[PDB]
Design an enzyme around this catalytic site. Sequence first.
Site, short mmCIF file in Angstrom:
data_model
loop_
_atom_site.label_atom_id
_atom_site.label_comp_id
_atom_site.label_asym_id
_atom_site.label_seq_id
_atom_site.Cartn_x
_atom_site.Cartn_y
_atom_site.Cartn_z
N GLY A 28 0.83 -1.18 0.00
CA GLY A 28 0.00 0.00 0.00
C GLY A 28 0.86 1.23 0.00
O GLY A 28 2.09 1.15 0.02
N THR A 29 0.21 2.41 0.01
CA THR A 29 0.85 3.71 0.04
C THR A 29 1.54 3.93 1.35
O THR A 29 1.11 3.41 2.38
CB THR A 29 -0.11 4.87 -0.23
#
Lengths: 242, 52, 105, 244, 237, 104, 48, 244, 241, 231
Positions: A28-29
């Site tokens: 994910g980010t």
Amino acid sequence: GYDLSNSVFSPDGRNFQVEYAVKAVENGTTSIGIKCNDGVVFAVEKLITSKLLVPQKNVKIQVVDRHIGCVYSGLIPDGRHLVNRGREEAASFKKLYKTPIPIPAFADRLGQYVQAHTLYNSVRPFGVSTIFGGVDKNGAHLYMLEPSGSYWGYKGAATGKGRQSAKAELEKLVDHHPEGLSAREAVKQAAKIIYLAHEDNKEKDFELEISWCSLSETNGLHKFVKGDLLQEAIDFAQKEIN
Amino acid sequence: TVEEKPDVTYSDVGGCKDQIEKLREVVELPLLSPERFATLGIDPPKGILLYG
Amino acid sequence: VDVLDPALLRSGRLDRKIEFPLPSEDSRAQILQIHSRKMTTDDDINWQELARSTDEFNGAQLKAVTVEAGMIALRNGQSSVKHEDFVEGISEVQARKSKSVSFYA
Amino acid sequence: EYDRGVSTFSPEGRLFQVEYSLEAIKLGSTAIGIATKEGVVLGVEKRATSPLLESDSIEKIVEIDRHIGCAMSGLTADARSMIEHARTAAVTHNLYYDEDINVESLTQSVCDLALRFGEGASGEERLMSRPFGVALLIAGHDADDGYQLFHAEPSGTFYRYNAKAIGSGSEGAQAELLNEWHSSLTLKEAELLVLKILKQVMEEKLDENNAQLSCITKQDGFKIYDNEKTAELIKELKEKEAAE
Amino acid sequence: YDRALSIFSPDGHIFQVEYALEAVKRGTCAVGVKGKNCVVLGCERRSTLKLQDTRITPSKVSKIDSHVVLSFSGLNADSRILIEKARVEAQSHRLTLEDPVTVEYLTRYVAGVQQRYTQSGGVRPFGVSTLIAGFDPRDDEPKLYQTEPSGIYSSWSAQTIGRNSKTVREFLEKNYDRKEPPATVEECVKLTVRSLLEVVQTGAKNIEITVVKPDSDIVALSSEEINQYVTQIEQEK
Amino acid sequence: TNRPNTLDPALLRPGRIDRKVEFSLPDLEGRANIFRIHSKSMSVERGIRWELISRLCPNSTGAELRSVCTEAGMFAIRARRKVATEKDFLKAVDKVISGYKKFS
Amino acid sequence: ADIQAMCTEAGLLALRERRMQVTAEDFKQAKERVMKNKVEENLEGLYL
Amino acid sequence: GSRRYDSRTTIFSPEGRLYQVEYALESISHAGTAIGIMASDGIVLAAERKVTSTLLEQDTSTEKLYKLNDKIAVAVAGLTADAEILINTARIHAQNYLKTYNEDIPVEILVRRLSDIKQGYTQHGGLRPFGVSFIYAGYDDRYGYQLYTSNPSGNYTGWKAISVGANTSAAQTLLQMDYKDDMKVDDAIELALKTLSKTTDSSALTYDRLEFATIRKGANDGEVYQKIFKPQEIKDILVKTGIT
Amino acid sequence: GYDRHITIFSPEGRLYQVEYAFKATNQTNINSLAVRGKDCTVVISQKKVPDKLLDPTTVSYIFCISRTIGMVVNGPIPDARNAALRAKAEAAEFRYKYGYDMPCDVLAKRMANLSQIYTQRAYMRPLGVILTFVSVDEELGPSIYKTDPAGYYVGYKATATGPKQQEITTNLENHFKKSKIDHINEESWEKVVEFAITHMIDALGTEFSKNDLEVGVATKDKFFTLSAENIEERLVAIAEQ
Amino acid sequence: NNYDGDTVTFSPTGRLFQVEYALEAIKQGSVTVGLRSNTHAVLVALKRNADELSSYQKKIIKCDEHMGLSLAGLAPDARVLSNYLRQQCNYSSLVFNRKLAVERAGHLLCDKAQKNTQSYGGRPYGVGLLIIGYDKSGAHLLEFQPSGNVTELYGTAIGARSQGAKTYLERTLDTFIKIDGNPDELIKAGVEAISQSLRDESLTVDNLSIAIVGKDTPFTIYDGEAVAKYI
């Protein structure tokens, strides 16, 4: 076997499905949470995948109540469902006990919800980690909630691909200030370690987002960092990494 | 077992199939014009495995 | 190795435990170019362009595009393989060759 | 593998149980439907399996309402569920609005029913574990678009056609239709056209104890042609095929 | 519960419907032949077995209505469920619409019971096929229908289901004409006895004959009556 | 190769094999065509539908279609005709399907 | 094949008894022997 | 999840045959012999227990014989556990009939009701059926004494003499030779004991392993007295018939 | 097949799914030691925090389920929370319907019964936590009841939990062998804390700090925890023993 | 095959494969290209017939007089999603006396898909929607993936050969955003955008289907000879 579902179990203590789900969050980010004296300052790396995109018009930061920032990584629909649930929980607390939900109380409820989906095979576990905190009546607090259903207090936390870079400098940030630091200064430090955690994502380009809930500046309301203050953070981080 | 250019065409093969046009591409195309392969710098195919 | 029993996997069995991920966006472009280096190479083609459109492609998948570009070139009766041909070659390795309508159009 | 589920994919990318259903229309006897702007004719191959069969109380022609006709092909056990719902739908519109339902609107309502498979998907009340195995040729007449002919899938998708044949002889029928259909075909020239195309895909002799005609006209409503009239037309085909 | 016991197959089928039809094949043979003034349903009984009292043993023909009879082939457990639902439905028609049910209405109703469990999950279909026959009120037209566990029904001039249905049907091609049914009640009755005497045989013990005559006249012809018919056919042949 | 799972990997490596193709069981209209060649050679009915026999068949190889034509020939000889119809082929397809499906 | 056996088993029975004649009754005993181990009670397992 | 651990327990086989019912008949063959004989003055039910021990109290046990109502008792052959549910369902059903019509339940009605439950379990729910076979002794005015056997599929068949459980074939063959319609309850008591001595489930048949019960119209005024004999009253009859 | 993948019986008669629950409570590597004083019950447990960036104050395993009854958890913290929530709800409920707060005995039995139900259901996973419930009741005195993931519980003179708990057992066994009674004869609750710390050092060989300890004390009619400042007073008081 | 048949599982890579399979409905599906300025939004869809007798399938559904969605995947799935948006649009009118904002309606649509991806026996919805509308914050263009995620762009495409369309829009990107008050130009550029999505499928006025919504223009679908003002 013992990996078909989540209520299979193994003598190894592993539950597989849940461990697998963390891999979505780990790809994910980058997202950080800095525990400050007056509040918390969240910042999230927002990837710019194309020039076609509208900048600062897609958010991964949704407010819960009027004083709890929540920013998450992993599967965006799944995390938006978890935050949607916790907006109801905040409303329920407010209905019944006539107060905005305390940050430790909010953590307890969410942990129960995420627990339920790892206890049944007829529903699927979650695969997101949320970082949430704010300013309540017991002080500022910071929590990160694992998709396992585990949370703790944190003096710094991070998640996503660039968590290695972030955490290493958060150690140094707590060694800069062992007596804690201002929320206002932490804007410029949140910028700096997103920029350093974008060296794990240097095949890509990014937009810096910063949001805060602090007593000193925003008076215990969660707001977004924008305008000249945001640009100052960018300029700060730029010179440091140069 | 060995023969020598036996008279069969595509008319006598019932239908035209994709697998026939893949044979045309291996067999006819480099024989007729190995020129085009050469200028391209793609190697001319000469190997085919037929299974079914 | 997740299937396989972990006793066999320990140190002295096998020492270094080395993962091979997929190629990334930039890596894809390098693997495409060398395949293309073998044939006629021209300023029409941009390997980076082809690398960004392909997604989740290893050398085995990337190789199918390149060869396949030069069969469209062969049929067309060209002597130089053009950029478009590579772009057309991507969509045959993919899930489509479909322009069908039934309930999924 | 990819059909053990109650709604599952498919490395192709489209639902698998639905795909089988579309290839089970072919199992049913041929249903032809030719639409002109002078009315729509529906012909069907009834099938006779024995001379002990009573085949004149068996048909694949069903009235939905006065101004909408239907011909069914595929597995006709499935179509029993669908035809009841269709009849209710049509009646509902005249209950609620005192108005005749559009042919398009009716088709769309039966498409909504067709998606009801799965037992954990969506918010709707699920009452199938598998999709229907029957395709319809809903013909009709509305005053907003004239005569219309729709082909409704067990998928829950629909296309408006000017002529569509489904069933066993679907491919060989439709081969002719692409060339032979045009808009200057009148109702009676359509009517003899049905029987010519049906003869090619007829696995028996062409006769009225294995074929049934029906029209849908604005003026006379949905009329199913009696076997006397159906027989007459069939004899008039064999004369005009000897006029060649 | 809703876990599929009926699921679509890659053959365009459901496996259990195919299986259901083989369950009816293994069942006992029921023949239906309609005259111009009667319907006749004669069926094979398994009353060969000794130490059996047939008074209290279920029959293979059960009346659902005053002028509607139902015979069955396949499982005997499954069939009784259809017979009970059919009867309840018949009395409902009298309640709200008046008049007894038509034969066609009952044919559709039994078919709709099979239909429901074919499509839905958590349920298997029945392995039972029926011959529903009778008259409608103020009608002397004999009605002979066949319903099957697929959920389809068809009318027939004559039909046979159960074991060796092909053999009986082949016999009926030459011994029954679509144009001309048996003229009298008695020739219809003897034709149904004659068809049973092919496969069933073994006296009038296992042979049953039920005749329904127009507008609610049901008489069952006892074994003694059947014995007379059998002897005449045997001697003539 | 019948099955390409019976061929050695040394053989499978490039240069030896530069194309790989699976032969597909011919389509229904495509069987009308495979049938057409055998039926034109045989004295038959003119105006025969080839497409009628192929409808009746399920997926069957072209070798089967060659056997069916011989088979129909046989039933034509038995009635003392040497000119076949669509009828002899209805028979011929029924023989093969029931016969082969069960076993090999 | 089994008709061939039944006819022979019926000579054996009548030879056993020491009686020249071969009865109808005799033949039933031979049916019993041939059919013996073909018994099926799952026939009325499905039917009943 | 839920579908993962299910194997589709109740479904047809290619023969048409229900797996669980086929399996169920095997487990009833494990359980002891129970015989019913219908005399022209009563019904004799006689069952040999599937358990015997010197420490087992069998002198208060009535583990096979249970009264459903005043004129209908059953003998049990199968799983005792499974049977217990049907036994209390039967009591409720018979009392329900008495409540609503103020008339005693006929034997046909009660048996049919239980049969419907067994069919129902294989029809839906994925439930195992009850793996028991009962012999019902019952009196009613209309048909007199009625004898019935029920099988685990859920179907009932009338008889005059019949055996279920262990040694069904052996018991049946002896009954065919000995049974007559001129038999009385006295004669039927003697026949039942002799048949159980030749179909014994060990190497001995004893009073203490015998459960025995009759329903006799020899009670005054045409009334029916159900008597379940104690093992020492069985012992008295054991010396009478000369088993001992 | 599925005799190890769900909670059905095996040919062995032993539920493998249940066994796996006990093979996950010792993988968190937290030891506990719980002793009954003469007027109190003291429980000390590990609180190893190896990070600068985890707040150690919020890392805890002692949850107050009643105002008088503490609960110390050995095993995974998601399951801990769920079991704590359920226990708190029941304890409140008992006050509501019976007019007095739930006893330690019965609160243990209630979680024990729910654990059995969770291993009765084949789609429900049991909560894989060993729960120690410490109290001082007025009808049972100083008490320890320890429930386990299967749904078994019993009372205790003293108990330990964790991977290294066998070492703890040795110390406790000697202590109650010599005294010849089921509790510590010490009339100051503070000194029962001091004793507990001493035997923890003896058993595990590990020298403790205030941030490796977390202490819960049930005295009569109240439950409190020591803060790290108060735990440091105890660690200084070891030097004064 | 243990994570590719079930919707309730992970998946050693942290995926669900059913969602990837649902994204292959988009590849094989029809194409639609959306582009907006700030004052007008535009959806230009390529309709596809089955055959000559067959009609062409409308790939744009009017959802409101200020809102429309267009399909590019599974047709039965679009009929579920289309109704749901309308229901919520009427809810906004009823409760808040307000148009349903495009931004809000994306988030609702997102979570509606999510809870069927969670549940066993569920499905991911294989339709990809492009959802335009004109609200109080101007023109909006949303892209709806089978995941359920909504993203905001000035030009996007989904369907077969989307890449050629996005290249065209990235070049002309600052031209069309700064053309405002002239819907015509935006529409003409969308015809040219979807001409890069061809592969000898051609363009005619019975394959071209345009729909726009403006500041002062309601949702309107142009077809027939009303797309012959741009061809």
